[PDB]
Design a protein around this ligand. Structure first.
Ligand SMILES: O=c1c(O)c(-c2ccc(O)c(O)c2)oc2cc(O)cc(O)c12
Ligand SMILES: O=c1c(O)c(-c2ccc(O)c(O)c2)oc2cc(O)cc(O)c12
Ligand code: NI
Ligand code: NI
Lengths: 183, 183
């Protein structure tokens, strides 16, 4: 049976801290953002705002917007398909790598980065957290929560206003002028 | 690409915090504990002691020792095989679930728990962290660090004294007399 939480009328994440739980494949809290489906299995409420756990999956596509996080560190661990990760270090040097399932990428705070899914229905396991809390409700805030299972039929394109206001609540800084010179 | 660190003569985890990095499948810092191989991709040094990221893989086996963590929350995210997760909640009710790849289990602090791998070379993605810091160097401390790739050839059984002294440094509390009555 399911739970009612702060985030969903129907969720498999228990609302109270301190409760163990299991969630079958795909049934975490879901959000749509562009063509991608984000699925949250644990958030800050579960971990005293220490860490989170979520997956991101999507169609073969182009790079997501280049961005950074001032106080948040991010893991990319590939589970399906192939994902090209772009990252610029603090010294301005850029790096790219095609990550295949079981490969790992790590993006520290203040490092500009982006990714491109290079196979249909690629999937990434992510953790996104830091001294300033956990990041997981970003996705449904800029994008939209989803009740349906599976990849969105139509991409969810946030209205411009969302891109201005979501940084006020979530640790994200967009870098639309950023150019990748790794090819 | 390879570094000497506080933890290993050779590592693909950079010693300097704030550096982006990639690690190919299997090439995180490795440790053996019983028949299992633990591979660390990010530790507390990478995240200001906020979270970590590791895998655990091993043969079809019996349940690991029942234990709890006083300040640490743990994620079980199955990537290969099938893994049965046992957990006792704070009110003493026990639960078990066979978790298959893509399935998720969450064990809050102070819940007694254990797992059993039920396919050869099953694999779990883990995060284990909390207000008490990050847990990942526990495995090489009770077990042993490993330079070679692959499952350990001989199980590493820790001497009884390590079970007494490792809890003084890592957030783990063994429950040697704990009995699972879930099936
Ligand atoms: O800022 C973003 C972000 O951080 C993540 C992300 C995805 C997978 C991970 O594994 C991870 O650690 C982070 O996705 C995004 C997707 C967007 O369309 C826009 C974004 O701004 C982000
Ligand atoms: O205390 C332990 C522990 O926490 C974990 C663990 C394993 C995979 C995970 O994904 C995770 O979150 C935790 O494994 C163990 C394995 C042992 O042989 C003995 C232990 O004492 C632990
Ligand atoms: Ni990001
Ligand atoms: Ni544990």
């Amino acid at each position: 049976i399911e739970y009612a939480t702060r985030h969903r009328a129907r969720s498999f994440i228990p609302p109270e801290p301190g409760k163990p739980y299991f969630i079958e494949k795909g049934l975490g809290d879901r959000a749509h953002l562009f063509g991608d489906l984000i699925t949250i299995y644990a958030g800050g409420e579960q971990t005293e705002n220490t860490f989170n756990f979520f997956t991101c999956e999507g169609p073969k596509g182009e790079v997501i917007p280049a961005h950074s996080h001032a106080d948040t560190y991010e893991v990319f661990y590939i589970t399906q398909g192939a994902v090209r990760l772009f990252v610029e270090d603090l010294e301005g040097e850029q790096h790219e790598k095609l990550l295949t399932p079981g490969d790992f990428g790590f993006v520290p705070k203040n490092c500009v980065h982006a990714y491109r899914m290079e196979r249909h229905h690629s999937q990434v396991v992510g953790v996104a957290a830091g001294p300033g809390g956990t990041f997981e409700r970003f996705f449904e805030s800029l994008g939209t929560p989803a009740e349906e299972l599976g990849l969105p039929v139509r991409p969810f394109v946030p209205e411009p206003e969302k891109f201005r206001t979501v940084p006020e609540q979530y640790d994200v800084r967009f870098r639309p002028d950023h150019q990748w010179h790794t090819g």
